[PDB]
From a paper:
Light absorption by rhodopsin induces isomerization of a single double bond of the retinal’s polyene chain, which triggers structural changes in the protein moiety to perform vital biological functions. Previous studies have suggested it is likely that GR could support ATP synthesis and compensate the poor energy production when the chlorophyll-dependent photosynthesis is low. Interestingly, GR has carotenoid binding capability similar to that found for xanthorhodopsin (XR). In this study, we present the X-ray crystal structure of GR and discuss the structural features that characterize the XR-like protein subgroup, to which it belongs.
The structure was determined to 2.0 Å resolution. Similar to other microbial rhodopsins, the seven transmembrane helices are bundled in a clockwise fashion when observed from the cytoplasmic side, and the all-trans-retinal chromophore is covalently bound to the opsin protein moiety via a Schiff base linkage with the Lys257 side chain. On the extracellular side, the B-C loop connecting helices B and C has a distinct antiparallel β-sheet structure similar to most microbial rhodopsins. However, unlike BR which has the β-sheet oriented towards the middle of its 7-TM helical bundle, the β-sheet of GR orients oppositely towards helices A and B. As a result, the tip of the B-C loop is facing towards the periphery of the GR molecule and the central ion-releasing cavity at the extracellular surface is exposed. When compared with the XR structure (shown in white), helices A, E, and G are slightly tilted inward towards the center of the helical bundle, resulting in a ~6.6 Å closer positioning of extracellular ends of helices E and G, whereas no obvious displacements are observed on the cytoplasmic side. Since GR in our crystals does not have any additional carotenoids, the movement of the extracellular end of helix E is likely to reflect the carotenoid-free structure of GR. First, there is a conserved Glu-Arg pair (Glu166-Arg174 in GR, Glu141-Arg152 in XR) on the extracellular side of helices D and E that can electrostatically interact to modulate the relative position of these helices. In addition, another conserved tyrosine residue on helix G of GR (Tyr249) participates in this interaction by forming a hydrogen bonded network with Glu166, whereas the corresponding tyrosine residues of XR and TR do not. Next, on the extracellular side of the Schiff base of GR, only one water molecule (wat-402 in XR) is mediating the hydrogen-bonded network among Asp121, Asp253 and retinal Schiff base, whereas BR has a water triad (wat-401, 402 and 406) among the corresponding Asp85, Asp212 and the Schiff base. In addition, similar to XR, GR also has the Asp121-His87 pair as the counterion (Asp85 in BR) of the Schiff base, confirming it is a conserved feature in XR-type proton pumps (XR/GR/TR) as well as proteorhodopsins (BPR/green-absorbing proteorhodopsin, GPR/Exiguobacterium sibiricum rhodopsin, ESR).
Residue numbers in the entry:
A (entry chain A), B (entry chain A): 31 to 276
The structure:
Amino acid sequence: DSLTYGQFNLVYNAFSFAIAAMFASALFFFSAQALVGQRYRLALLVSAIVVSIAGYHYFRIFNSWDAAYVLENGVYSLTSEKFNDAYRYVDWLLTVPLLLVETVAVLTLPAKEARPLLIKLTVASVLMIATGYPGEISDDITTRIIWGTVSTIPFAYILYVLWVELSRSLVRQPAAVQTLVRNMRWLLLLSWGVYPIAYLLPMLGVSGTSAAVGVQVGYTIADVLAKPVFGLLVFAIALVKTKADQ
Amino acid sequence: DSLTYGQFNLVYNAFSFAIAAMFASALFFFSAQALVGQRYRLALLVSAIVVSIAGYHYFRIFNSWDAAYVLENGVYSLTSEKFNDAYRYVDWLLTVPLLLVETVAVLTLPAKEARPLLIKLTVASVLMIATGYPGEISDDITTRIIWGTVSTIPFAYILYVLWVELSRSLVRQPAAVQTLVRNMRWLLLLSWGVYPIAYLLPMLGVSGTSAAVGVQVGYTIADVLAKPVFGLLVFAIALVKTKADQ
Ligand SMILES: *C/C=C(C)/C=C/C=C(C)/C=C/C1=C(C)CCCC1(C)C
Ligand SMILES: *C/C=C(C)/C=C/C=C(C)/C=C/C1=C(C)CCCC1(C)C
Ligand SMILES: CCCCCCCCCCCC
Ligand SMILES: CCCCCCCCCCCC
Ligand SMILES: CCCCCCCCCC
Ligand SMILES: CCCCCCCCCC
């Protein structure tokens, strides 16, 4: 249905803020390669690639939102072009595996262990995103609950596996490294937890237009926390690891 | 006069974006003290203080803008509470001298030279900001040109002195340090140059409401470039200097 002034702007502003955050962080992460040792530059480069891809999609998402509504009679009425919910899920399919690479890369695990860990996590993320999409686009609450519950299964698998692997990497490492890795553990858990909570809004009653606004804003803030903010923690780990290698 | 939908939002969004950028960078700069040597932590702390103060004032600026207009008849009409142009100039009076401290602090000059350099630059910045304010608030174009031209005199003095001092600090320093200091020279010149250009908009013809929107947006983007973005360059210099001290 139609959207109020404040509702259209909240999403409009959220997408504009995301474009700026992704592209500005892309420049930072790319240049920050020169501040860390050679062994950790791949994690910085992948982080720059992640936010560049997300920045491209938020540019497309911004245009899809702008073209979906029209200001008339003091409100925003729905136009003929429907909002493209697929841009975000296509973005997730590409960037979430890259986020997993960035995470494993800064920990410097041996290839015999890093490779099967990455495949299992990447396969799980594809299952998570693929099962979430039909529930995301449904107009039916029961359907949204069923697909979303299925999507929680690989979601819990990824977070459990990453918590254990990050905890196992702590051993022997210097104290400054250990504190950053422990805090990366929590930022991963809390930022990724925003997504299913935001997915739950259309079923907590409330107006359907208010729920749809909350979902779009929630996913956007979550993307900012899980990609550029998370990337800053990866950058700090690379700095301290570079120093420990003297 | 009254403001269109898009005009009120552009400023509304600009102030919201500034609050987020200042407070998020404040947390980063405060914590980044732990990534640099003890001799450079003061520059990081002052940078955190700068953006915390600016964040407070943009919170007050955001509320003053929100309270100055009211949505009615599909437009925004001017309310009884007038917008407070003084918040920004009071903010500049406090943070610009602190920005000058941050700049001198990361260069590690001796006290016999750092102290008189800081006093002369601080006195010039007060003169620059104080003479600019009467021209900023005038409804008369001739008055805006006269006070603004006077304000350009200490403005040019500050930029000339900082260019020379930064250039003189280059000597002997390692190659990685020298490139960052040269780029800090340019970011300072270009970011500070946005302010008088934005000040010029109300005299290039154009609608008065469009000019007022452009001034507020221009100053806000300039503040983001000259405080948190500039602070990231200071942080990089402190990182490379920490390493050169081995
Ligand atoms: C950069 C983008 C990222 C890190 C995407 C994260 C997405 C999730 C963690 C997915 C959450 C979902 C469920 C667990 C609940 C059902 C619906 C989903 C797909 C949103
Ligand atoms: C963080 C805030 C900063 C760095 C403020 C910078 C302000 C200026 C460089 C002042 C510019 C002005 C003139 C040179 C032209 C006349 C009006 C002014 C005050 C805006
Ligand atoms: C850092 C590189 C990102 C470049 C983003 C370009 C986005 C172009 C969108 C074109 C849509 C037609
Ligand atoms: C980082 C500390 C900044 C705290 C900003 C608080 C702003 C409070 C504004 C109160 C206005 C009444
Ligand atoms: C669905 C939430 C999964 C949380 C994983 C955390 C595992 C910690 C166990 C030590
Ligand atoms: C008003 C612009 C002042 C520019 C100062 C740059 C000085 C460079 C001379 C070497």
